[PDB]
Amino acid sequence: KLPEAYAPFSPIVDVLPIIPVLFILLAFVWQASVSFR
Amino acid sequence: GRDQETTGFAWWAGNARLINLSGKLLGAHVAHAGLIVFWAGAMNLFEVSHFVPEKPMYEQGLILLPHIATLGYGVGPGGEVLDTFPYFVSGVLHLISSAVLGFGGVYHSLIGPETLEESYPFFGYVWKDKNKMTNILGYHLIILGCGAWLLVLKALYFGGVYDTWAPGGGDVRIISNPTTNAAIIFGYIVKSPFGGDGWIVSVDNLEDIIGGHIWIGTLCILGGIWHIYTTPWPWARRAFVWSGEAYLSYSLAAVSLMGFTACCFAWFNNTAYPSEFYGPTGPEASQAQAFTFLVRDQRLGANVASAQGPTGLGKYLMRSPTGEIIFGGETMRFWDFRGPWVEPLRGPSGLDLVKLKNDIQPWQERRAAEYMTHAPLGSLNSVGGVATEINAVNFVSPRSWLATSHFCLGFFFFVGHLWHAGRARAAAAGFEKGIDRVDEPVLSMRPLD
Amino acid sequence: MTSILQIALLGLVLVSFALVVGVPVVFASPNGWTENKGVVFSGLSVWFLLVFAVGVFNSFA
Amino acid sequence: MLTLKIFVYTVVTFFVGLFIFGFLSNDPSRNPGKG
Amino acid sequence: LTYDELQGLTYLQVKGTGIANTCPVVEQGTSNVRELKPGDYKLEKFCMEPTSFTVKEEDAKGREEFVKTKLLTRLTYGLDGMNGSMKINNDGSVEFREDEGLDYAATTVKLPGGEYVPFLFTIKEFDGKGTLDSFSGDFLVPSYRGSTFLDPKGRGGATGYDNAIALPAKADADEIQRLNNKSYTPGKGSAVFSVAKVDTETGEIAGVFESIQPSDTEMGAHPAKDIKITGLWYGQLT
Amino acid sequence: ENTSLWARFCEWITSTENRLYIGWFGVIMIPTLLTAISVYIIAFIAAPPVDIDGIREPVSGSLLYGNNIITGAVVPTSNAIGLHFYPIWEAASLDEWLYNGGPYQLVVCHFFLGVCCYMGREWELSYRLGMRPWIAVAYSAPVAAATAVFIIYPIGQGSFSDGMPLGISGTFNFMIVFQAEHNILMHPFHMFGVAGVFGGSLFSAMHGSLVTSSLIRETTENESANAGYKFGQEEETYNIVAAHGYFGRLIFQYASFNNSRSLHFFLAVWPVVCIWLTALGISTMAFNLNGFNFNQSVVDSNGRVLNTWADIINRANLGMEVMHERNAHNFPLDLA
Amino acid sequence: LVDDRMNGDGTGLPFGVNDGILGWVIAGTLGTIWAIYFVSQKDL
Amino acid sequence: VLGAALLCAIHGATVENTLFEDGDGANTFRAFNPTQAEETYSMVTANRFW
Amino acid sequence: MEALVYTFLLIGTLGIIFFSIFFREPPRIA
Amino acid sequence: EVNILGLTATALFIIIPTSFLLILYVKTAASE
Amino acid sequence: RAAEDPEFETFYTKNILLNEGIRAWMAAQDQPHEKLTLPEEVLPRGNAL
Amino acid sequence: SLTLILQLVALFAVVAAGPLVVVLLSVRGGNL
Ligand code: CLA
Ligand code: CLA
Ligand code: CLA
Ligand code: CLA
Ligand code: CLA
Ligand SMILES: CCCCCCCCCCCCCCCCCC(=O)OC[C@H](CO)OC(=O)CCCCCCCCCCCCCCCCC
Ligand SMILES: CC1=C(/C=C/C(C)=C/C=C/C(C)=C/C=C/C=C(C)/C=C/C=C(C)/C=C/C2=C(C)CCCC2(C)C)C(C)(C)CCC1
Ligand SMILES: CC1=C(/C=C/C(C)=C\C=C\C(C)=C\C=C\C=C(C)\C=C\C=C(C)\C=C\C2=C(C)CCCC2(C)C)C(C)(C)CCC1
Ligand SMILES: CC1=C(/C=C/C(C)=C\C=C\C(C)=C\C=C\C=C(C)\C=C\C=C(C)\C=C\C2=C(C)CCCC2(C)C)C(C)(C)CCC1
Ligand code: OEX
Ligand SMILES: [Cl-]
Ligand SMILES: [Cl-]
Ligand SMILES: [Fe+2]
Ligand code: NA
């Protein structure tokens, strides 16, 4: 568990792993927004 | 970025559009360093968050807290977790490093210099400047030697890292007199990869591991100075293809090789991958089956030395393919096992039946959590053990999982190596985009029959 | 002491969030990196200051 | 009985040596293309 | 390799070298043999490894002969870790009797021509009566397999089908040898020993032996053959 | 270059004028594969019965020992071996080497090296002929499958005895015990592989039909329709626009495969990536990650075990595991 | 023992070498191919 | 079915690796023209290769 | 008689494969 | 012993289609 | 030949016996109309499994 | 619980930040 001073931030911690997968998906949004140039 | 019609490459090949743009290469690479460090910090934060301290730390689905705990950072005598602050501070430092790395990466991708050699000759390179490629290899190899010597500093001067082979069930031990001798280190690197010895998964002791780290750090540092202060030879420049695509192929083949190696490391080692922190390997939990059953039926009253199984070999003991006595289950394929609870039960010639009868220890006896649950079964969807086991426990062995992820992704990297090997060779020849349609090598040489 | 560290960490989360949503837009903005230099320096200096503040506040919390 | 081992080890090192020096021996220039 | 120097080697040094299969010998002892002090002994660690494996076969012309063979079994043939006693007097008569230990070994050997002959190298329940120069007796010989062993049709003894599952129209008085009997009656064998290289200070005797034991009867379908085993044995007296 | 023995040897090895191009990958492909073929043929004919399971209870698997070809197989090594490297020189006799299971190790090791050097030989000919090199990349899927069932699974389960025997009935036995202890049939990679082999057959029939229908008349119901012109002209035959037009009219004419290069890349990539995935599924269960374990998954309000198709498959799988190694288990759980 | 075996299985033998003549002939074969290649290098 | 998957993969790969030059951009898919009447692949090269 | 039948068909098919590989009709039209 | 029915079946299934294919081959090569 | 010789076996013989195992352990609930209340001691096993 | 509510609001904030960046770069000029 987290220590006492950081316990309320654990739900904010609990969403991070999907962000790298969202990075390639953001690259897909980029490539679609430039209309696949 | 730029478009297809000028770069020549489609969107699904767009990362090759920056082959000749060293600044954009730097931006993408620093951004990737940010991505890797970001995943490391995030996952260390999760594995801190999802911790149950009273249980052994391998059933919680945590892969890299064993990486910190193998360094002994907050590890009890028997293997107790004690504290989680080193894991927390490691994760947060990784996250801050990830933020600064990602900012640098996006900066060099967007507003960083588009081409590097016009302002920074130290940082710019065409992909035939073989001397400066060797300089870059020298820099990176010096870095790797520094990292190996950092592990040296931890093992000998900072009082860390857990030895599983200390008496009583292991201990975090500051390593004194590591074995750095060339005979043992090179014999460790040039032996067979099979169950007789095991090529690189054979390091039974951390003096041997740290002496190997002495050797790799010294070799990388000296080879870094060499690569900095030398020029490629004619034989190397003729045998090799020198382009950024061939360099990808070499890197891909190498990284696939060490990926396959890391998979086997996770699957078999119980020394550099402590079973108390990772879960049991393949040969154990089955050695634990045989050990628990032998002690249990010798406790009830049935003898085991004169006990004979259904097939004539022995239900609880037999002789190995070599003249030593080994455990009598179906674990007779795993007679080459070495785990921290068998050497006090290991005799020179045989298994020392009188030692088994009397000199049994209760730590060895209580080492049954590896036996009962936690075997390296575990299914794709958790559930229990074997494919027929029912929804009773939620467990999978991280050894299995970061073995299969690594070996699968290493195989895909072997495929990528094959792809860029062929494309690099064909492009350096001159036919990466096809045959020239008017003068083919086919029409120039003789028919087969 | 715990409340001070928690407020500092919350502010650090918001500052890093602002940096994340702002740095790529400002960088890829046409003629934006040369004009938002002061605010980017301010955001980075504040970000580093809150990081070092949480670091020195761990030992008292 | 080790004689079989010596013979097969010799022929294996022979074939491997052919492979190693064959690809050391200016292999990328064995191409009809302009390279 | 005397037992004293074997204990001083690590488990890795012996691993893969086969010296664990080798029984300990005596070099500092004497060959007086009759010099050994009479009384009662409670000895331990019967070590027993073979040196040859020759199998008796019957020609259809009427004479008795043996022939050498080739082993399909790897290094699983020695006996290690028993305990027992003999009651020795001044003249030399003994009362040798093993009790319990690794008193069996699964072994498979072929005669010239290619016929599988598996056998269980057992010495169990051996009574030893006679002088030190030559004392013999009889030892219990188990079948080979447990009664829970299964043939590839799934039939068997204590467990199984004991019926023709593969073909349902064959249960007459012809498969009695294959289905009905399924005998596991344990046989008996004779082993003659000899004590050589006696030790006076710590009581170590390491002689040779010749043991007649029947082969495996498999499932009782075909009669067993006789296998004589020549080798060397070892024991420490306490 | 011509009075030099090694230069002559190199220009003969790398010569594309030979009937079979060999190259430097071929000088290491030919001996390993020929050795494996020779010992495989000799073992399949006259292999003495070999104990696969380490329980001194052997299987025959050879024609001269009383079975036909489909029930006969080159059988894996003994369970006493494991991954322990048992070649002929590790045996005091050829006879004991044969009983222990050495020819399987020899054929599998040599077949692995020969297949990888066939990969290299194929790339080498692609290079010397001036082509594009991705034939070996497409060939990587059967290579991955062969390594998965001959090397990766023995490594993962700790014993070559668990590897796939070289046979047909042996293939079925390994396949069924694989079902029993890993539940491959309920795995997403194996479903991708089945989808890929069915789709590979589908796309093979589809492409073949669409381009054998798209025939401008140069081969009539006679041997050819040469009456327009005989052999020896560059006037090309066949059609490829009409095939895409027919495929477009077939369902919805929006996922266009008009480019022949795109169409052939799709036909190349679909079965190759799917066989990659199913070979990796075999690789995952080598490290014993299994498939979906959907038993005990559906319950009612009172918590009763409510039977399911997954429970049907589960009882079938455990009925498979009960005959798996009738006498080679002394202990309840199956881990080794 | 009942038969003469190599008894080198395992024991950490580098390259599987148990007697020096095998290592010497490995080095001899590689050196022979190397000498042939070196003297016949540069094509001519 | 296994031979059909074999044929599909081998035929697609062979066509894709015999696609000629047909342009200056390295994206070979755009190097194809549905208007042109020439073969998109060198079947001579493919036949001698296999 | 059983075993030589299997041996003959196997080696015969391998012979037809060998003959088709090395002694085929030389290829025409591409 | 010896399955003469299977031996005959296998023998004719070899020889008759083999002779058929060979006779059309040699008659095709006789008159190209 | 497997009936007259308990020593001969093949992967085919293993597969046949394994098919009997599949039938016996699966048809009990797979065919509800057959009322297959077959006890566990008539259902066949190996050793230890 | 409050943990789930914070988890969801943090999830939405971190998933919507990226498309916000690309839309802001699309409407505030270009060079993306
Ligand atoms: C490992 C992931 C990764 C990385 C690091 C890169 C990096 C890069 N790519 Mg690339 N790409 C990727 C994946 C990746 N790519 C994938 C998966 C595809 C297939 C769809 C592509 C296809 C592709 C093409 C076709 C092109 C590039 C190009 C580029 C380069 C310039 C991009 C640019 O300037 O436009 C700007 C990008 C954006 C405006 C969108 C990204 C949004 C921001 C910048 C990042 C997200 C915000 C983040 C939180 C910022 C961090 C802030 C920090 C303070 C924490 C660059 C160095 C170009 C190139 O080759 O250079 C000539 C090019 O044309 N890529
Ligand atoms: C990953 C880091 C790295 C990389 C990428 C390179 C890359 C390179 N090095 Mg180098 N080197 C390194 C680290 C590295 N080195 C270190 C750490 C040292 C210090 C020991 C050296 C010392 C060194 C020297 C002295 C030389 C090179 C040379 C070269 C170049 C020629 C490669 C070659 O010799 O062909 C391939 C080599 C072989 C086929 C024969 C190698 C002998 C065997 C394989 C090693 C024995 C170990 C064992 C038996 C292998 C089995 C285990 C294995 C399967 C894992 C090449 C570009 C040459 C050079 O500088 O060019 C000018 C040169 O002579 N390096
Ligand atoms: C070396 C990589 C690696 C390894 C060994 C692990 C291992 C583990 N992870 Mg983890 N993970 C990883 C990477 C890895 N992860 C990455 C990169 C992410 C970011 C998305 C995550 C995010 C993550 C979360 C959120 C969680 C885990 C969890 C776990 C543990 C249990 C797995 C589970 O619960 O469900 C298993 C998940 C799956 C079986 C999904 C499989 C997805 C497949 C591999 C995708 C590819 C399939 C196919 C090829 C796609 C083709 C189409 C393509 C073109 C798109 C386990 C020990 C859990 C845990 O215990 O917390 C720590 C959990 O909560 N992981
Ligand atoms: C989705 C992609 C993905 C993911 C999520 C992972 C994830 C992981 N990989 Mg992995 N990998 C991948 C792709 C991926 N990999 C690919 C494509 C390959 C090529 C096939 C590999 C090859 C690979 C190898 C070879 C290894 C891993 C390993 C690991 C694990 C540890 C990572 C690590 O520490 O690296 C290493 C980080 C560095 C090298 C840089 C940091 C340098 C060190 C840490 C500094 C030392 C600091 C010291 C110890 C502590 C400070 C003390 C103070 C006194 C200074 C981890 C769970 C390791 C493993 O198997 O677990 C043991 C490992 O050996 N991977
Ligand atoms: C660190 C290794 C590495 C690096 C630096 C590169 C770099 C490059 N590759 Mg390459 N490649 C690699 C590994 C690598 N590759 C591997 C391992 C494979 C085998 C799978 C390939 C196969 C490959 C092909 C076929 C091609 C390239 C191409 C390219 C170039 C353009 C990339 C691009 O913009 O495509 C765009 C990027 C994308 C479309 C993103 C792909 C998304 C993937 C498919 C989804 C899977 C992700 C998922 C989460 C992981 C699942 C887990 C796994 C176990 C399945 C570029 C220079 C192209 C080229 O030849 O240019 C010259 C090209 O044709 N690569
Ligand atoms: C039990 C211990 C086992 C572990 C120890 C193993 C030690 C292995 C160390 C070998 C390292 C050699 C790297 C050369 C790489 C090829 C470079 C090349 O393309 O080389 C070619 C290059 C082109 O100019 O030239 C050159 O750089 C010349 C470099 C080659 C050097 C020649 C090798 C030494 C020759 C010794 C002859 C052996 C003779 C036979 C002895 C028989 C005894 C009866
Ligand atoms: C740390 C550690 C250690 C140590 C280790 C080491 C020391 C390692 C090493 C190693 C080494 C020392 C290595 C090396 C190597 C090499 C290689 C790997 C190579 C290569 C290459 C190739 C493959 C080639 C190819 C080719 C040819 C054939 C020729 C020409 C060119 C070309 C490219 C074509 C130990 C275990 C003790 C302990 C634990 C850990
Ligand atoms: C260019 C490009 C790209 C890429 C990008 C990138 C890669 C980015 C990044 C970046 C990064 C790499 C980032 C990272 C980061 C980090 C951060 C931002 C952080 C932080 C901080 C904080 C604030 C924290 C806090 C805390 C703590 C301290 C602990 C406890 C809990 C908490 C969480 C509260 C793409 C592909 C898209 C497209 C193409 C182009
Ligand atoms: C928040 C927090 C904390 C605190 C912290 C602090 C107060 C501090 C820090 C820290 C840090 C501070 C970290 C870091 C990072 C770093 C890095 C990441 C670096 C870098 C560098 C580089 C990367 C370089 C590059 C280059 C250049 C540019 C030049 C030339 C070339 C080269 C490449 C060398 C702790 C964790 C305690 C706990 C929890 C909370
Ligand atoms: O060897 Mn082939 O299969 Ca692998 O699990 Mn245990 O061991 Mn046996 O049973 Mn199940
Ligand atoms: Cl067992
Ligand atoms: Cl089976
Ligand atoms: Fe076509
Ligand atoms: Na059983």
Author numbering:
A (entry chain k): 10 to 46
B (entry chain c): 13 to 461
C (entry chain z): 1 to 61
D (entry chain i): 1 to 35
E (entry chain o): 62 to 299
F (entry chain a): 9 to 344
G (entry chain w): 60 to 103
H (entry chain d): 204 to 253
Paper text:
From these four complexes, the photosystem II (PSII) complex catalyses light-driven water oxidation and provides the electrons used for carbon fixation. PSII is a homodimer with a molecular mass of ~500 kDa, each monomer contains cofactors such as chlorophylls (Chls), quinones, carotenoids, and lipids which are coordinated by at least 20 protein subunits. The eukaryotic reaction centre is a dimer surrounded by tightly bound monomeric light-harvesting complexes (LHCs) and trimeric LHCII complexes. In this work, PSII was isolated from the halotolerant green alga Dunaliella salina.
Initial classification of the dataset showed that approximately 20% of the particle population were in a stacked PSII configuration, containing two PSII dimers facing each other on their stromal side. The stacked PSII dataset refined to a 3.68 Å map after applying multibody refinement, with each dimer defined as a rigid body. Subsequently, the stacked particles were classified according to the higher quality PSII dimer, and two distinct populations of stacked PSII dimers were obtained, as observed for the unstacked PSII: one in the C2S2COMP conformation solved to 3.36 Å, and the other in the C2S2STR conformation solved to 3.84 Å. Roughly 20 Å separate the two stacked dimers in both classes, as previously shown. PCA showed extensive displacements and rotations across the population with stacked PSII dimers rotating relatively to their opposite dimer by as much as 30° and shifting by 80 Å in C2S2COMP, while in C2S2STR, the rotation is more restricted, showing a maximum of 19.8° and a shift of 57 Å. The rotation axis of C2S2COMP appears to be broad region containing the N-termini stromal loops of D2 and CP29 on one dimer, and the stromal loop connecting D2 helices IV and V, CP43 N-terminus, and the C-termini of CP43, CP47, and PsbI on the opposite dimer. In the stacked C2S2STR, these stacking interactions also include a stromal loop from D1 which is pushed in the stromal gap by a change in the position of the PsbT C-terminus (green arrow in Figure 4k), this shift pushes this D1 loop (connecting helices IV and V) into the stromal space and closer to the adjacent dimer. In the stacked C2S2COMP particle set, the larger range of rotations means that at the extreme states CP26 and LHCII M2 are not involved in stacking interaction and can pair with additional complexes, while in the stacked C2S2STR particle set, the smaller rotational range seem to be restricted by CP26 and LHCII M2 interactions. The stacked C2S2STR (left) state 10 (cyan) is tilted compared to the initial position of state 1 (red), bringing the top dimer closer to the lower dimer, resulting in a shorter range of rotations from CP26 in state 1 to LHCII M2 in state 10.
